[PDB]
Amino acid sequence: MDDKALLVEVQLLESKTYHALSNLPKARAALTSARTTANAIYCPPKLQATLDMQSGIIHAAEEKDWKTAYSYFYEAFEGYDSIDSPKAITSLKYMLLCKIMLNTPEDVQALVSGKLALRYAGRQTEALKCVAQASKNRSLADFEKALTDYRAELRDDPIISTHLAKLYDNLLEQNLIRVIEPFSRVQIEHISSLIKLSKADVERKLSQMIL
Amino acid sequence: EVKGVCTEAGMYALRERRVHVTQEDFEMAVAKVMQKDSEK
Amino acid sequence: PKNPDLRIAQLRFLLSLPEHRGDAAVRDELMAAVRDNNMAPYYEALCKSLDWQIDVDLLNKMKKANEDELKRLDEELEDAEKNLGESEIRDAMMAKAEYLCRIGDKEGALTAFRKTYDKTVALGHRLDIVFYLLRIGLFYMDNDLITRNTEKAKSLIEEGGDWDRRNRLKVYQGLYCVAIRDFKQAAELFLDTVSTFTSYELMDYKTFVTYTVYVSMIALERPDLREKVIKGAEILEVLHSLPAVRQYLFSLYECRYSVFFQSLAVVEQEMKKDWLFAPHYRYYVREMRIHAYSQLLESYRSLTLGYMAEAFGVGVEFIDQELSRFIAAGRLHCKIDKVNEIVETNRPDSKNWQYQETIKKGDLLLNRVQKLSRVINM
Amino acid sequence: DVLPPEADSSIMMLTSDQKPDVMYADIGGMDIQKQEVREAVELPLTHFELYKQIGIDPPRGVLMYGPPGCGKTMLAKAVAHHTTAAFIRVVGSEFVQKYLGEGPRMVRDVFRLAKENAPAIIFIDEIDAIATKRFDAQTGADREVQRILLELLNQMDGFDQNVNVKVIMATNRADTLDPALLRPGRLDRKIEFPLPDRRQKRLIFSTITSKMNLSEEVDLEDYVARPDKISGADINSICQESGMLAVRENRYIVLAKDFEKAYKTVIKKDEQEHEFYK
Amino acid sequence: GGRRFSEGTSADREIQRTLMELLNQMDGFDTLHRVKMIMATNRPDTLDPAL
Amino acid sequence: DCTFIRVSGSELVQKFIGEGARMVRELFVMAREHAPSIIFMDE
Amino acid sequence: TPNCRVALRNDSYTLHKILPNKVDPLVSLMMVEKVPDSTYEMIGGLDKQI
Ligand SMILES: Nc1ncnc2c1ncn2[C@@H]1O[C@H](COP(=O)(O)OP(=O)(O)OP(=O)(O)O)[C@@H](O)[C@H]1O
Ligand SMILES: [Mg+2]
């Protein structure tokens, strides 16, 4: 029939529901069909940023290029700027979780201190600042209290529950070079005592570093 | 337009910092070059 | 044509060198030898074969058909020059000399390819002629003629992009650098495995995947195996159909050391019977053993030698004689003790071993130029 | 004896008090052209290897054109502010010097200065003073200009795809150009700056009126809704006039009555629209 | 001033060069500060729209 | 092997054919000197 | 040759030496226009018009 713009919506909605029902390469194609369809509409006034969000979701769902996936969540928030407050505040989460995944933890506070993001204050932007602060001081126990405080918005999203376990490994070795740094030969019984973690798993994890 | 598309397919590959041109870049290139065909 | 032509050279290897296995190989090659007009490349193969006493009419029915294609070229060369195209004599047999390249030997090919090289003003036929000269120079192992036209190939690609003539070309050095014992080049020429197409010579793409993984585990260390061939979706899913080679690569990565030797015995047996790795299959594992040894040995310092029996490979005395010959070889930096039953390692600096290879090349180039200046000037 | 290179016109854009300090955020609503001038000017300047690696032949020079007052001179100012390369800025009506042979010497030492210095960027404005169509080999004032164009058409051919010299050129009338200048190998990329209509129009009101008071209540969307063919060079003067209309009343805060008097003052079209036609 | 032409005579070659030098020196890459311009004509029909 | 000459009637070209070239036919002096030549014309 | 450069002394204007080959004006003409030099190998699907 006549329309073209509503085809973009139903292809984007199928792109939601193959990913959330755990089928990535079928969700990859249904996104691309919405990519090649939205390239012909003269006015995508608001649906562009809605497509720009899951242009970043599925492209970060395989974790190949976080830098270009960060560029999608920026534009999806620029399109959500000052016109749609529920969709905008979640767009702060996907850019700064990516930035901690990018391992530039100080730049998280540099954005939210910016005057465009000073307006969108709330609970979930504080859920990112504490975790960025936890990865800033580079400690395991600093990460744990930030999870337990803001669990209602941190450990609730269906992609965060996937991306926390990969971030935990990176911050495990980030505190592990921190405490090991100031010395020479040392015992293994103290580094387990200074991380509050076991000895057999640490020793294998230490062995992976020198390999 | 064939040399218009096949040159422009590199511009999609270069704007996402790839080094190989892929089959989804060509079909994204058709919908823009034929869009200008649909303009006047 | 030269497109099914490499399987012939594999089956000639399949004929002669497995000595007991010479019955079905002399049948299925003769299934293709005395058809498709092949005349020249199997006289001495017939000498390595049995008698096959009546081949005379078998040759006469084919050398006639060789002449039949040759005489219609002799009926073409006067009708093409009368009302000329772009020298349509040459332009006809610039596609029919590759027949004569397969049928006759290189001489009908080389005098006709260098003929038609000067005909076409664009490289798009020239650079395809050069791929023919490369391919016959692998059959007759023309190691001095491939050095000429490879530069003459590569000098053509710079004008234009020619990536179906560059990425195609990279496979040829990738098969040549693994023909010679040069593995850090062969994995580098096999770096892509993305633009590498479902070709004619590795008609399975998955056989190309086996060749690019067997060389990749030698050439590079593990900051790069842990990024490139463990994370490539182009390389994971093609060995996802392979139970052995997925296990063969990951056992070194997962530190499953005992099952590493198990599948290595399969591959090294397979590497013996494979063509083009059989010149260097005994060079492979002795580099893969010492690669497997030093990875485990450089993590610890006070490892006992009897720990490696039940966790790395059985036989304590088998570990004993094998480490004894590699420290004596001047590699595998550790120092085994005997009568308190422990293996102690060291860490030498990257000066003396870097110094050691310099004094080799300095003697070798001085060997070259001293011998040269005696020959020239009387 | 051989010399270091030298020119008088221009020198090298002295880099301290020479940037015209306009940033990318000033130019409101030019999303295609801000993006597409990047791919032709400074993205091959820095990321040269990807163009070499894919093999897509980066453009030598670019011709930007359109109706007057569409940010042609403005977008060149912002490129020169955020560059990392040398920027060479010439006016294209200074090659007509009085003495003969000055001009062809004046052309060839620009690119020699663009060679020796850097991976630089040449910017020539009002090429209509040089590149026209019609000539007359009887006057001498027209025999000179014909030798001017045969220099830079020769000098743009003397590149080897290795030096990173980009030539941005901007005109107002593309009709009075010889198509010898627009052959591939010399000028391959053509950018028009069309006139903004409504979607790009409301973005220009946002960036201009961000600086002034504009008290609290004055609407801007009620002026974007109207028709009638407004440039980008007069939306500035809608706001430039209305501020003076408030300063005249000794009133330092913009009212909504000021914008109504200022809108009908700038454009001043009558109708040209005898209604019985439709 | 003039408008422009499709280049009829040889004279208005070098006047449009003299005109386009004026257009650039007004607002091309220079802070045009404290320099006010006043122009007068009987008929503004024949003016270049770029001016 | 033909000297592919195209004419557009331009005037930068004009100084290499002749000083006034009151005809177009003065092109043939350069054409009959590269004798197996081809003249080309656009729309 | 007619239309060939020379060197030339200046005291007596005596001919000195042949100065090589400058240009044909036809060569400069096509050099200005820059036609896209092509071949049959880049012709896409026009076999009957060839
Ligand atoms: N975002 C904008 N888009 C378009 N024009 C703008 C914008 N912001 C300001 N302007 C105004 O447009 C005017 C024209 O700038 P510029 O000189 O670049 O246009 P132009 O196309 O070069 O016109 P001309 O060629 O006649 O000089 C500027 O003086 C400025 O006042
Ligand atoms: Mg301007």
Curated annotation (Swiss-Prot), chain A:
Highest taxon, organism lineage: Eukaryota
Signal peptide per UniProt: none
Keywords: Acetylation, Cytoplasm, Isopeptide bond, Nucleus, Phosphoprotein, Proteasome, Ubl conjugation
GO MF entry, a single one: structural molecule activity
Acetylation recorded as keyword: yes
GO CC annotation: cytosol; extracellular region; ficolin-1-rich granule lumen; membrane; nucleoplasm; nucleus; proteasome accessory complex; proteasome complex
Residues that span the membrane, as ranges: none
Induction: By FOXO4; expression in embryonic stem cells (ESCs) is mediated by FOXO4.
Subcellular localization: Nucleus; Cytoplasm, Cytosol
Post-translational note: Phosphorylated by AMPK.
The keyword Nucleotidyltransferase appears for this protein: no
Cross-link Glycyl lysine isopeptide (Lys-Gly) (interchain with G-Cter in SUMO2), sequence positions: K115
Tissues expressing this chain: Highly expressed in embryonic stem cells (ESCs). Expression decreases as ESCs differentiate.
Domain PCI: 65-211
GO BP terms: proteasome assembly; proteasome-mediated ubiquitin-dependent protein catabolic process; stem cell differentiation; ubiquitin-dependent protein catabolic process
Biological function: Component of the 26S proteasome, a multiprotein complex involved in the ATP-dependent degradation of ubiquitinated proteins. This complex plays a key role in the maintenance of protein homeostasis by removing misfolded or damaged proteins, which could impair cellular functions, and by removing proteins whose functions are no longer required. Therefore, the proteasome participates in numerous cellular processes, including cell cycle progression, apoptosis, or DNA damage repair. In the complex, PSMD11 is required for proteasome assembly.
Record organism: Homo sapiens (Human)
Residues of the full protein shown: 160 to 370 of 422
Swiss-Prot record, chain D:
GO cellular component: ciliary basal body; cytosol; membrane; nucleoplasm; nucleus; proteasome accessory complex; proteasome complex; proteasome regulatory particle, base subcomplex
Subcellular location: Cytoplasm; Nucleus
Residues holding ATP: G66, P67, P68, G69, C70, G71, K72, T73
The entry's keywords: Acetylation, ATP-binding, Cytoplasm, Nucleotide-binding, Nucleus, Phosphoprotein, Proteasome
GO-annotated biological processes: blastocyst development; proteasome-mediated ubiquitin-dependent protein catabolic process; proteolysis
Family as reported in the entry's similarity comment: Belongs to the AAA ATPase family.
Described purpose of this protein according to its UniProt entry: Component of the 26S proteasome, a multiprotein complex involved in the ATP-dependent degradation of ubiquitinated proteins. This complex plays a key role in the maintenance of protein homeostasis by removing misfolded or damaged proteins, which could impair cellular functions, and by removing proteins whose functions are no longer required. Therefore, the proteasome participates in numerous cellular processes, including cell cycle progression, apoptosis, or DNA damage repair.
Record protein name field: 26S proteasome regulatory subunit 6B
Taxonomic lineage from the root: Eukaryota, Metazoa, Chordata, Craniata, Vertebrata
Whole-protein coverage range: 141 to 418 of 418
From Swiss-Prot, chain F:
Subcellular location: Cytoplasm; Nucleus
Residue numbers of N6-acetyllysine PTMs: K15
SUBUNIT field: Component of the 19S proteasome regulatory particle complex. The 26S proteasome consists of a 20S core particle (CP) and two 19S regulatory subunits (RP). The regulatory particle is made of a lid composed of 9 subunits, a base containing 6 ATPases including PSMC5 and few additional components. Component of a complex with USP49 and RUVBL1. Interacts with PRPF19. Interacts with TRIM5. Interacts with NDC80. Interacts with PAAF1. Interacts, in vitro, with the thyroid hormone receptor (in a thyroid hormone T3-dependent manner) and with retinoid X receptor (RXR). Interacts with ERCC6.
Function: Component of the 26S proteasome, a multiprotein complex involved in the ATP-dependent degradation of ubiquitinated proteins. This complex plays a key role in the maintenance of protein homeostasis by removing misfolded or damaged proteins, which could impair cellular functions, and by removing proteins whose functions are no longer required. Therefore, the proteasome participates in numerous cellular processes, including cell cycle progression, apoptosis, or DNA damage repair.
Family of the protein in this entry: Belongs to the AAA ATPase family.
Protein's recorded name: 26S proteasome regulatory subunit 8
Natural source organism: Homo sapiens
Gene that this polypeptide is encoded by: PSMC5
UniProtKB/Swiss-Prot annotation, chain G:
Full-protein residues shown: 109 to 158 of 406
Organism from which the protein derives: Homo sapiens
Protein name: 26S proteasome regulatory subunit 8
Family, as annotated: Belongs to the AAA ATPase family.
Functional summary from the UniProt entry: Component of the 26S proteasome, a multiprotein complex involved in the ATP-dependent degradation of ubiquitinated proteins. This complex plays a key role in the maintenance of protein homeostasis by removing misfolded or damaged proteins, which could impair cellular functions, and by removing proteins whose functions are no longer required. Therefore, the proteasome participates in numerous cellular processes, including cell cycle progression, apoptosis, or DNA damage repair.
Phosphoserine modified-residue sites: S12
Coiled-coil boundaries: none
Subcellular location: Cytoplasm; Nucleus
Subunit comment: Component of the 19S proteasome regulatory particle complex. The 26S proteasome consists of a 20S core particle (CP) and two 19S regulatory subunits (RP). The regulatory particle is made of a lid composed of 9 subunits, a base containing 6 ATPases including PSMC5 and few additional components. Component of a complex with USP49 and RUVBL1. Interacts with PRPF19. Interacts with TRIM5. Interacts with NDC80. Interacts with PAAF1. Interacts, in vitro, with the thyroid hormone receptor (in a thyroid hormone T3-dependent manner) and with retinoid X receptor (RXR). Interacts with ERCC6.
